[PDB]
């Protein structure tokens, strides 16, 4: 095969920040290199941590600027979207004071206006954060059909003048032409193996090298309604929560990939919990278990019990447990909402309790 590396540059964008980082690296400064994304960022399915695309890019910085001290920040969490990204960005990323951030959600997000809005919130939050990091968008692709959410994400890339690179226009073309057979680079048409991770990194490093060897735009008003930029998780530390059967999980989170932490569990029909959640949007995070059977709950907002949403912990897929995030209220009234979650179905032989990870309240941050 032969990749057309120039076709990987989906958006050149404004290179001011990225070139400032390179200049700091050249001067031998200490720099924080970060990655925020789904399972491909976390590193699935590389055979070792050092062979995922993220570590390859990290190794690029080290090798290109041996005088600098780099710190590796991998904030990938498998099977999650930019909607979780904007709510976790402060804790998982921005608290680490990153100098360079890859954002990688284009095969996690669906290609919809909803995800355009959540990704815009994430991009705005990271781009305007204290350390004013260089941001590079990375767009992976599904190898079974060529799909991704780059139509939505790319609109955000062009709106903010951000650099962006794509596998949809580099690797997938060699797959569809039959010069790379899918199983050479991915066992499941989504997660790259070692060979695939090295190809993904090569597309990214092609661009980083071009930038290195080659005044910021005015920060614009949002393109979408941008109602997710402020996204606050309500977890078991929240002082307005009242349990009636649900019990807080106080166990240690070893790291962020241990994602069923800081929430609450329940095993019995009728177990419930009530939360006060401010915003115009409400979403809920909970476990979908491949260990079956498991309980079913309902979530009710502002007593609208006739319109409860069913949260079923019985996962019908097999790759593993999913950290589900369901949007319950969108573009509603911005107020303190009452939220209740109650268990509605249990089984004598339930393998696991229901795990309520968070309720997320969101609203616009004014421009």
């Amino acid at each position: 095969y032969q990749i057309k590396y120039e076709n990987g540059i989906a958006n050149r964008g404004c290179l001011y920040r990225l070139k400032k980082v390179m200049d700091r690296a050249k001067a031998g400064e200490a720099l924080n290199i970060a990655f925020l994304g789904g399972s491909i960022t976390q590193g699935s399915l590389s055979s070792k941590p050092e062979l995922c695309y993220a570590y390859h890019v990290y190794e690029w910085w080290k090798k290109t600027f041996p005088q600098a001290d780099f710190t590796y920040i991998n904030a990938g969490i498998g099977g999650t979207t930019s909607q979780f990204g904007v709510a976790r960005a402060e804790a998982d990323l921005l608290s680490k004071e990153p100098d360079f951030v890859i954002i990688e959600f284009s095969v996690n997000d669906d290609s919809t206006e909803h995800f355009m809005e959540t990704y815009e919130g994430l991009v705005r939050k990271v781009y305007t954060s204290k350390t004013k990091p260089a941001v590079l968008l990375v767009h992976n692709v599904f190898y079974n059909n060529g799909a991704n959410a780059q139509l939505m994400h790319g609109r955000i890339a062009r709106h903010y003048n951000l650099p962006a690179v794509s596998m949809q226009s580099t690797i997938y073309p060699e797959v569809v032409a039959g010069r790379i057979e899918n199983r050479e680079i991915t066992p499941d048409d989504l997660h790259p193996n070692d060979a695939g991770h090295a190809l993904v990194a090569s597309v990214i490093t092609y661009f980083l090298d071009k930038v290195k060897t080659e005044s910021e735009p005015d920060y614009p008003a949002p393109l979408t309604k941008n109602t997710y930029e402020k996204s606050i998780r309500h977890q078991n530390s929240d002082e307005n929560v009242v349990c009636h059967g649900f019990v807080a999980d106080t166990s240690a989170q070893r790291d962020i990939t241990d994602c069923f932490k800081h929430g609450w569990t329940a095993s019995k029909k009728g177990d419930s919990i009530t939360l006060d959640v401010e915003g115009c949007n409400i979403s809920v995070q909970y476990r979908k278990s491949v260990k079956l059977p498991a309980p079913v709950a309902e979530i009710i907002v502002d007593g609208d019990a006739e319109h409860a949403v069913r949260l079923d912990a019985n996962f019908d897929e097999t790759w593993g447990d999913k950290l589900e995030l369901d949007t319950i209220l969108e573009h509603g009234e911005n107020k303190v909402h009452k939220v209740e979650v109650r268990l509605t179905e249990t089984h004598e032989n339930d393998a696991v309790p229901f795990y309520l990870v968070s309720v997320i309240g969101s609203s616009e941050k004014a421009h």
Side-chain angles (χ1 to χ4, degrees):
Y1 67 86
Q2 182 180 151
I3 294 165
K4 306 192 211 314
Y5 276 91
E6 282 289 317
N7 291 342
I9 305 159
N11 199 47
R12 166 188 189 275
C14 168
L15 307 171
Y16 178 69
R17 286 189 187 192
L18 180 45
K19 277 166 166 184
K20 273 195 36 171
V21 173
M22 295 186 180
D23 284 337
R24 284 168 62 198
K26 193 166 223 288
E29 295 191 17
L31 294 161
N32 294 326
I33 306 301
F35 307 80
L36 183 76
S39 62
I40 302 174
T41 295
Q42 178 284 323
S44 305
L45 283 161
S46 62
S47 65
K48 302 167 213 313
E50 297 74 23
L51 292 181
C52 69
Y53 90 77
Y55 202 85
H56 285 303
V57 166
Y58 170 69
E59 286 193 317
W60 183 92
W61 286 96
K62 290 181 67 183
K63 188 62 198 298
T64 304
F65 309 99
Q67 55 274 30
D69 284 295
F70 296 101
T71 299
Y72 177 63
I73 302 149
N74 191 320
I77 302 176
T80 70
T81 68
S82 65
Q83 185 171 6
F84 183 31
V86 64
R88 76 197 179 82
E90 274 300 339
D92 292 358
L93 176 64
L94 301 179
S95 70
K96 318 307 200 192
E97 295 172 301
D99 295 299
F100 170 89
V101 177
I102 277 170
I103 296 174
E104 187 283 297
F105 283 114
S106 308
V107 290
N108 287 99
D109 290 16
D110 295 324
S111 203
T112 64
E113 293 252 21
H114 171 74
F115 287 112
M116 195 168 35
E117 190 177 358
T118 66
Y119 196 87
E120 180 164 36
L122 172 63
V123 168
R124 291 178 67 93
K125 171 171 288 161
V126 171
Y127 184 71
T128 67
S129 64
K130 186 171 57 260
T131 71
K132 300 292 191 270
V135 176
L136 170 67
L137 307 188
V138 169
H139 310 298
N140 279 302
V141 68
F142 279 91
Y143 293 97
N144 52 307
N145 63 5
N148 70 13
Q150 181 179 336
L151 180 70
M152 304 295 103
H153 295 168
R155 292 170 168 157
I156 301 312
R158 285 185 302 271
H159 194 68
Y160 294 95
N161 287 292
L162 298 176
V165 295
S166 175
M167 316 304 135
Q168 188 175 59
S169 53
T170 49
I171 305 183
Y172 174 73
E174 291 297 285
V175 171
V176 76
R179 282 186 292 268
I180 298 172
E181 208 281 322
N182 296 54
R183 297 293 165 266
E184 299 186 292
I185 61 169
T186 171
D188 59 14
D189 290 328
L190 172 57
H191 306 98
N193 63 12
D194 291 341
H197 275 282
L199 231 24
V200 164
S202 73
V203 170
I204 295 162
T205 64
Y206 177 85
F207 174 74
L208 289 182
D209 272 321
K210 174 193 292 288
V211 173
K212 167 177 191 278
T213 62
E214 257 184 16
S215 328
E216 173 155 284
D218 294 331
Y219 183 60
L223 187 61
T224 77
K225 292 188 192 290
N226 186 44
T227 68
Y228 289 89
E229 196 180 343
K230 181 169 184 213
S231 287
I232 292 298
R233 280 175 296 184
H234 297 260
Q235 294 189 285
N236 72 39
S237 52
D238 188 298
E239 53 175 37
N240 287 299
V241 170
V242 182
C243 297
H244 304 288
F246 269 86
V247 45
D249 166 23
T250 61
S251 71
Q253 187 168 46
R254 308 189 278 207
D255 71 304
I256 68 177
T257 66
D258 184 12
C259 55
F260 309 108
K261 292 290 170 292
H262 299 340
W264 306 265
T265 57
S267 301
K268 294 183 185 174
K269 188 166 172 175
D271 286 349
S272 52
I273 182 177
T274 61
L275 306 93
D276 293 340
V277 183
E278 196 166 2
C280 62
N281 309 323
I282 306 290
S283 78
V284 60
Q285 285 187 296
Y286 60 104
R287 176 169 60 209
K288 281 186 177 162
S289 169
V290 289
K291 290 185 210 199
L292 292 190
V296 179
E298 78 186 342
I299 183 161
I300 299 175
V301 176
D302 294 325
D304 189 2
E306 294 287 355
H307 296 103
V309 175
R310 183 220 255 278
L311 316 178
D312 188 339
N314 297 280
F315 200 22
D316 51 348
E317 307 176 30
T318 58
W319 55 264
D321 291 343
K322 177 183 193 192
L323 175 52
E324 187 57 86
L325 192 160
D326 290 335
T327 301
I328 305 310
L329 182 63
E330 186 169 61
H331 300 159
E333 175 175 33
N334 201 332
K335 64 166 177 160
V336 63
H337 297 275
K338 169 170 179 296
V339 182
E340 175 173 33
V341 179
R342 188 171 178 94
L343 256 51
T344 62
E345 310 175 31
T346 61
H347 314 84
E348 227 301 321
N349 58 327
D350 273 337
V352 296
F354 190 96
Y355 201 107
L356 179 62
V357 173
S358 79
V359 180
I360 301 167
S362 304
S363 62
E364 328 91 303
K365 182 172 168 203
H367 191 76

